Amino acid sequence: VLLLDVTPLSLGIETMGGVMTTLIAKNTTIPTKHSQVFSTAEDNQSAVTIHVLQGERKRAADNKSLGQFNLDGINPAPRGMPQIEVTFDIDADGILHVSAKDKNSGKEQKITIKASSGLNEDEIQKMVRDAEANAEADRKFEELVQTRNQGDHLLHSTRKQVDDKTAIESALTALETALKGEDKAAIEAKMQELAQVSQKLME
């Protein structure tokens, strides 16, 4: 074969912090079916938002949206606990079916997206030449959101382990006021501090 039909671009979902986390790589041959288990970003999260994205760039907002939908009913429960199976199927006709399932509740939802949607050739050329153009660029937002997400969980997971307090609370607002920043090593520095006024709650 000289020819073959492929889904032209990365396709995935958005995850915490606003990254695109893909399920099916660009130029993958289709029909192709893929599955990936997600969980919940915050504790006692009851519902989630599955957003389908087309494109290569690390930041969700930069990729083409194909659709979105909710998965509700999830038991309130500690972040990471709920097993949320996300599945992409592209059949023959290039019809794209996404579906998210709560292993617990067994609650499930699905979206059916049209073959004709996404990016067009011109768009798909620019997506890529845009992508590698901002390679370094995007590997940067990568570890950033990695760290926000990390400091966020703490901000959260510290706040409830608590005078080394008047102090912890301090950190907490040095951490909160940094998370919002685009300076990683900062956020992480600030994390470092919390890491050491808080010992005397582990002690």
Binding site: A41, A47, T49, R79
Partner: peptide, 9 residues
């Protein structure tokens, strides 16, 4: 690995 989502709107 394993990834996390957010709450809807």
């Amino acid at each position: 690995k394993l990834y996390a989502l957010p709450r809807p709107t």
